[PDB]
Amino acid sequence: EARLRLHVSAVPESLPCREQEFQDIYNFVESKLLDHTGGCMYISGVPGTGKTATVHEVIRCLQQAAQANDVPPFQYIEVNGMKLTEPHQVYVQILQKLTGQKATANHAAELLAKQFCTTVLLVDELDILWTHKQDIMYNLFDWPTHKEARLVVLAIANTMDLPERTRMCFQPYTYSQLQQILRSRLKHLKIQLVARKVAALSGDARRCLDICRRATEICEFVTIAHSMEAVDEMFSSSYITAIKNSSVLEQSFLRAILAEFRRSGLEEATFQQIYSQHVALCRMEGLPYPTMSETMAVCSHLGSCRLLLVEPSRNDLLLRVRLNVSQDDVLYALKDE
Amino acid sequence: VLCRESQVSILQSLFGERHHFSFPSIFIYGHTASGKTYVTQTLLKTLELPHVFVNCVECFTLRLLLEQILNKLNTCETFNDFVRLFKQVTTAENLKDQTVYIVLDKAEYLRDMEANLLPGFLRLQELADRNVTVLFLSEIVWEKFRPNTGCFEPFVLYFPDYSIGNLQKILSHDHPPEYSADFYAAYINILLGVFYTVCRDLKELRHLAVLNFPKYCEPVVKGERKLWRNIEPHLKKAMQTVHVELPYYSKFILIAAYLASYNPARTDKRFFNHLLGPKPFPLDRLLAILYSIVDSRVAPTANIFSQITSLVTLQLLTLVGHDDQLDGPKYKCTVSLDFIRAIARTVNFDIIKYLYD
Amino acid sequence: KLRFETYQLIWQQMKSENERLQEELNKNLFDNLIEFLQKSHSGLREIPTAALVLGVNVTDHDLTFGSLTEALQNNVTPYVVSLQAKDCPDMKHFLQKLISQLMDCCVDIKSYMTVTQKTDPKMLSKKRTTSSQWQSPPVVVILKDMESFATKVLQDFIIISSQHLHEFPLILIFGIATSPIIIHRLLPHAVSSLLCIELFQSLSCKEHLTTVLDKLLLTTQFPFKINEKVLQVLTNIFLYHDFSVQNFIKGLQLSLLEHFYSQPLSVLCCNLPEAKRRINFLSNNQCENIRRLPSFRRYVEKQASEKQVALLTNERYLKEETQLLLENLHVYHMNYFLVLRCLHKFTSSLPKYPLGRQIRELYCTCLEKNIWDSEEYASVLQLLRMLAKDELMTILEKCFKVFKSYCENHLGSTAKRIEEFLAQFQSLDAKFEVLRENVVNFIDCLVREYLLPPETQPLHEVVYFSAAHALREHLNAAPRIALHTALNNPDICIAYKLHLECSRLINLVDWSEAFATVVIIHARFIRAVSELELLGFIKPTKQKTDHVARLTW
Amino acid sequence: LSQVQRILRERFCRQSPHSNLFGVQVQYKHLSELLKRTALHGESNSVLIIGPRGSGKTMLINHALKELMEIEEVSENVLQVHLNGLLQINDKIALKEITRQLNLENVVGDKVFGSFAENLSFLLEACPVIFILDEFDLFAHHKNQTLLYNLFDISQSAQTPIAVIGLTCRLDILELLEKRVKSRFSHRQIHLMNSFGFPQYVKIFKEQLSLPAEVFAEKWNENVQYLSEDRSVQEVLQKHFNISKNLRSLHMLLMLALNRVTASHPFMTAVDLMEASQLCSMDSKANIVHGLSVLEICLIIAMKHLNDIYEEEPFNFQMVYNEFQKFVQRKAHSVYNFEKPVVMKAFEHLQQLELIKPMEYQLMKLLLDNTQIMNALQKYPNCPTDVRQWATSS
Amino acid sequence: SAELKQLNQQYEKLFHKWMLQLHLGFNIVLYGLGSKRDLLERFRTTMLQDSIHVVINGFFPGISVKSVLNSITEEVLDHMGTFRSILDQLDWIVNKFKEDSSLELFLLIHNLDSQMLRGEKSQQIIGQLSSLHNIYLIASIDHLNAPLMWDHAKQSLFNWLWYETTTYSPYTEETSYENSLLVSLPLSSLTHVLRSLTPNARGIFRLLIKYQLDNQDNPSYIGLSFQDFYQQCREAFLVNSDLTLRAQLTEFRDHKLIRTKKGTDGVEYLLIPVDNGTLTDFLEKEE
Ligand SMILES: Nc1ncnc2c1ncn2[C@@H]1O[C@H](COP(=O)(O)OP(=O)(O)OP(=O)(O)O)[C@@H](O)[C@H]1O
Ligand SMILES: Nc1ncnc2c1ncn2[C@@H]1O[C@H](COP(=O)(O)OP(=O)(O)OP(=O)(O)O)[C@@H](O)[C@H]1O
Ligand SMILES: Nc1ncnc2c1ncn2[C@@H]1O[C@H](COP(=O)(O)OP(=O)(O)OP(=O)(O)O)[C@@H](O)[C@H]1O
Ligand SMILES: [Mg+2]
Ligand SMILES: [Mg+2]
């Protein structure tokens, strides 16, 4: 249970290492809350930057403050866009969390309009609420600006351009910031040459905890060598691996592709042209003739694993073939030996 | 069944014992008349293995195709999700332990239906784990069925075309109704000796074998060997084989249109590639050529423009741009030239003289 | 007006006998549709079919598809359905109407929101309603246009229905104009065989034309007759333009009526007693009117005295002499037709047909100008004097088996000349005999009995209708004659002169300025030209900057 | 007896749950490891098994899952849910399919929950579950990816024991996931299957044909080991190896040669496998050409001449008809001369066979390789000397 | 001034006759040189008169076949606005008419040529209606291709009585709607200057127009500088050099197709001294 207790600490965690962002959001809600007014704040960032976690923290703190009467009471509501099949179910959620309970999306939206013509509403990943007419976004952002509406809106998504089609952004995590979170809870061990090794990344936090959690799995069955192995089992590109393990005729077919490309110089060629090249190579390697039924199989083996991008098999000799891997990568996979 | 004996040994031994397992999928290719399903149905009927047989062109949708397969086992069925559900739920002392066969005929039409349907069937054995064998047979090579993400590759079995000898042995000796089978043999040997190089379909050869048999043996009952001389010109009559009344100004519009089709562009000055097709007409050009060739010079009436509109409506003429029929017509003549010659012969005008060739 | 009571009388008598004779010309072909269909029903995966060739007439035959729905619901044999091709873009509407129509073919004779139909319930109606009939019904699926069938759709049904078959021995009738090659075009060879067709024939417009003229307009029943010019213009709209007996009929009403608004002088147009009633009703204005027209004025010119004024002043001796004009008149016309048919079996047999072929032709050319004065007639003479022998004795003996058949059945007269001819030809059956019969056909008939329209009795007007031109304005639809000749022959007149003059394309710099070299002054050419757009003698064209260029030639 | 057949048939055709695991020793450790961690402890993980098709995945996960549930605590406390992208094409179908496999059908339908996640969470809360997603590629293609996102979202933040194990053949899989789902996926836990060495292939060949401990089996295995080394079987196995490097393709080869074994042919021979190999090596499109009528052939030779004249430009029936007419012109008499409708019937039959493709007034291009044509002509049974001379004219 | 009235009077004698024709199921037609307004509106004041006379002017772009069937069905018919599918519309109006008999409705169309009436659906409507006996049709035509668009089925559905009807009157209210180009440098002189230049020169001019028109409502837009317009032209591949764009703007300025105004900054700003209506019309012609 020594280095095994370090397993238990990776999957979720607390408390935040985003110190400055937290304060900004707290003061935003506190400002709007103290005044008995509404507002909206859009939060950008990379998927791993601690946006929803920080918000949840700010909420728990504001509820504590609401118990001592430091800040006005009370209610809070959260809904996730990716948790719904059909965007319009949002109106049901919001209403169901408030009074009035169940109703259709049409009747709910009408009711929310009535209520809004204090409450904190978190809409996490409203990128999913995009619709042709975008009525729901227009409503969520219009509601807090009504006189009779006291509503504070916190909108999270991954892109800065969303509101362009009262704002904040979470930058990706740096060398030191990631290094911080890992040792931040290693307190079982107060092994730390690794925490900085894994810490060079782009830019998610989940990568760190999941990577190092795998490193411990390597150790048992932690040094820097264990983490290099951990990363090489994850971020390592599988394409070059597959080309090395591909069969004989599969490689000759790639050589055929590279031959046709070096002739034309384009990124597309037809199975017919590639076929002529493949015949030439099989002739020069002492191989048997590449029966077109075989070569079609091969070309599908390489298109099933996405080494190739191939037109549907119905087109027969007119298949147009693109490489899903850069020519330099293939030459390196074939020529390494 | 004859001349397929080799394919029967392969396909029979593959079936093995009925409580065994067989290929998850088998794919037979060949031509229309190869005899594929005749062999499949016999083997399934004779042994007798439980099976179902379904035509993929008859059932275009999932509901129809899947409901047929489910019903024929002895049932509202939308998606392949519920087939494995309700096929797996179909088990009894009849089907409990045994190999079940599903023959999808003309599977070539599965390609056009539902993306996940052909893959689901190739792997259907392990999807329901019910000891199934899906039998695909189509005239299309397996190389054209493969999808992007792939599939479980079936066993590709080739049913070869019948030779001229395989045809006679199948076609001849199995119905010598009123005579010695040697007489009917020499008959068929002559039948193929004509029609083989054109029609290799066993189905159609059986027709002609029945059709022309009476005339072949007619000299026998009338008291007159070597009848090859008798029917050969009659057979060759069938080999290479097996009056529209129009108004005057209409005929002239039509033949003018054809003359506009054949001769093109700046030849109108002198006058007034054939395998490629017919050219386009501006209505003005057609009226010009018409009044040029008419040599009666009748003024235009609504009925005449109605005549040309009626002509295009009858599909004797066709315009690429249907929408633009009054703004500039690009009409195109379809018929010709024999019909044009007939129009010329009846009218007495000559089509050939104006043809630039 | 009385002439409209006569209209509806004649009119619905006409479309009546037209639709009945449509039903008989059917009846050989329809008795051969149910005799063919009952020959194939007398004697797998193959749809037999029936191919009917109806040349290029649309609406006249929808009657007989209503009557195939009826008649082939009547034999107790099928329950018939008709699929139209334009109804029919997709593969769904044919199987939907397939079955809608054989569950429905079970309904109409007993005396949902139609989205509800699909490909199942036909297979059920000759299963569920009757799977065991036992004798299967045909459903002749009348494919009224198979030519416009969508070809993909076409083979998908002939293959789907063919595949399904012999549970449904469908036959399907083909409404068609052309010959078999075009079916063999739009219906592929696989279909040409799956159809197992036996080619059938249906009668076209031009036959119904010549028939109906021989019968109807040239009947002696109705007095109304037509002048050379609206006969020529009509049979020109029929032969040279539009082949529908529809447009010839509606044009024949419009002729009927058109005349029948001419003047009351036709109230005497009726049977001699029906006309003479009107004689009694005649008043002094009309007495003025008969005093006026020619062939009366001509009839007044070769004549007498106080006799002549009791035509002109004292009406009684006229109205007596009207019963003299008219009695004769309706005598003459009978004396013609009896004799016109006569001519036909003579010369309709003949070659060169220089004077004419079909009965309508002889009526036409005979009435146009003097047969005698025409030399093509004399040519026909030389012919008959040539043929002689047994061709003539057979055809002439058929002129009496058949024309004595007319005066035995078709015509009552009884004119006493007919009888003399008749005896003459009996005697022959038992050259200058052929030339005294033809000279009898010459002096005794063509000279005498066949004679012209204008050489005829008094009052050949109003029974024979002049004034062709206005109808041609009201039917032939010749706007560009009046337009062309009007715009040619004055600022828009001169404008169209310029629009004729300049070159081909006329630049609005030096068109506005050439029209200012050649010609308030501008606005009328932009309205001339904007009309010439609206009229269409030019177009507002972009082939060059600021240009106006004609599509019309 | 036929006892041989019953065994190899469940091994070759159906996929034998128990067999020898070749070269997966590393990958099995990582999978079985993770599986203990989610089942025995309260940990939640997600992993992808990624290889070519026909090798690896489904047997690995099947073998791993079996050994896992042989632990008494596991079999009682652990539920497993098997999903497949072919069967469930919609995340709503999948939801109701999870509800079905969890025996949670007693919800029952009275409460339709306000959100997709709320319904999924409500199911797990009614205690680990192992989610197997087969054909993971297709689950990535569902609209907004609700099933993947919310499974990973539940796998990470919900602390409900769950195991999300995907199977895919796509090296491109990771690029098919949304940024959000890619993050929540326990990052790039990846097992790769791929291939082996030729000597390992032969050892596999002999191991799959051999029979287990079940004197009849001992005599059988001696003969297999004899086959393992032969100049014939080896030069055939290599030819298949240079293509396959796959145990499923091998299974097919062993199966077809297994029909050759009967009560009159007790054990396989070199010829049994050579014949079985010949059936697989056939060129399908060459077989189809062999059965055409001489008319259709002459048309293809016309099309061949058209691609060699007009330089690979498409063509229509007319120009084919012309070039074909030039062929019969040689002799004044009519031998191959037929009516245009008939020639088009055969032409349309080539299209009906998809030996010609469109893009008469329609342009089309020939789908045959010239070496297929010249080889087929030499192998055609009755081919007349006249069409052969014409073929080489170009 | 004298003649026309007499002719507009003569046609009036056919009028009652047309009424009878209207009873018999045919529909009269006027092919004139001029307008029948005084004659068709005298047909409204003399013959039609009565009630149930529907008037839709086809030279009016305003009325539409859907709003033709509304304009018939909304006010005069009074039953309803015609339902979405016009075939269903006519099925309701007809199940009213087939049920309610002996209701004759006389409709007079000036210039069927339209649009909106160009649609084969529009004349399948007018084909059915004027085929439906209750109402009746008097159309006035101009377009030479008017007989063009009427097919067999429609000239059957329309049984047309065609009349000399050679009319001399304008074409005043018919002429009030049509606009022509004679009504700053006018459009056609602009086109005439620009047609002798290169394709890229015309492209440059169209780009500068576009900038002028998009900003025309902003008083603070004084135009583009040469460096800005030169970058914009480079990005559109209209000009690759300073020298060629400067030469092109000078050639424009000699024709009076650009004017420069010094900004506050001493920089020359490029405007076009042509009415923005004329420039708008130019861009609508060039595509
Ligand atoms: N500073 C941190 N300390 C501890 N854990 C962290 C930190 N930052 C991120 N995490 C990890 O990230 C998760 C919190 O989610 P996060 O706030 O990144 O959601 P999100 O950014 O809204 O999701 P997405 O951006 O993908 O929509 C936690 O479960 C934790 O494992
Ligand atoms: N050996 C044979 N003996 C007798 N008839 C045969 C033989 N082979 C084929 N036939 C004919 O072919 C028919 C069998 O159809 P066949 O087996 O060719 O269908 P199929 O090949 O499955 O059809 P398709 O290939 O068009 O799907 C029989 O009804 C018979 O007419
Ligand atoms: N390393 C191996 N160990 C055992 N069997 C193997 C191995 N590699 C391949 N096979 C055989 O190949 C077949 C592969 O089946 P499996 O479904 O497990 O993977 P797969 O075919 O790639 O799955 P998919 O359906 O995604 O293609 C099995 O029948 C198995 O017996
Ligand atoms: Mg979030
Ligand atoms: Mg698998």
Author numbering:
A (entry chain A): 490 to 606, 614 to 661, 674 to 698, 705 to 735, 746 to 861
B (entry chain E): 8 to 81, 95 to 244, 251 to 268, 299 to 328, 349 to 433
C (entry chain C): 41 to 83, 97 to 164, 188 to 506, 548 to 606, 628 to 657, 676 to 709
D (entry chain D): 17 to 142, 152 to 239, 244 to 388, 398 to 432
E (entry chain B): 284 to 466, 471 to 574
Question: Could you share sentences copied from the article?
Answer:
The first step in genome replication, the binding of the Origin Recognition Complex (ORC) at origins of DNA replication, triggers a series of highly coordinated steps leading to the assembly of pre-replicative complexes (pre-RCs) in a process that involves CDC6 binding to ORC. ORC and CDC6 then function as an ATP-dependent assembler that first recruits a ring-shaped MCM2-7 hexamer with bound Cdt1 to DNA, and then loads a second MCM2-7 hexamer in a head-to-head orientation, whereby this double hexamer is topologically linked to double-stranded DNA (reviewed in [O'Donnell et al., 2013; Siddiqui et al., 2013; Bell and Labib, 2016]). Here, we report the structure of human ORC in a functionally active, ATP-hydrolysis ready state, providing insight into ATP-dependent protein loading as well as DNA and CDC6 binding. The structure of HsORC reveals a remarkable similarity between two very different ATPases: the replication initiator ORC-CDC6 ATPase and the replication fork DNA polymerase clamp loader.
To examine the functional significance of HsORC1 movement, we employed both negative stain and cryo-electron microscopy (cryoEM) to obtain the structure of a more complete HsORC particle. The purified HsORC1-5 described here is a fairly unstable complex, consistent with the dynamic assembly and disassembly of HsORC in vivo. Cryo-EM data were collected on a Gatan K2 summit direct electron detector in a Titan Krios electron microscope operating at 300 kV, resulting in a ~20 Å resolution 3D density map. We docked the crystal structure of the HsORC motor module into the EM map, which had an excellent fit. HsORC has the appearance of a right-handed corkscrew composed of the AAA+ and WHD of all the subunits, and a ‘decorative’ handle made of the large helical domain of ORC3. The RecA and RecA-like folds of the subunits (ORC 1, 4, 5, 3 and 2) form one layer of the corkscrew, with a little gap between the RecA-like domains of ORC3 and ORC2. The WHDs form a second layer with each domain sitting atop the RecA domain of the neighboring subunit. The structure of HsORC has an open ring architecture with a ~35 Å central channel, in contrast to the closed and more restricted central channel of ~15 Å observed in DmORC. This larger opening can now easily accommodate a DNA double helix. However, in addition to the drastic reorientation of HsORC1 in comparison with DmORC, the position of the WHD of HsORC2 is also clearly very different between the two complexes.
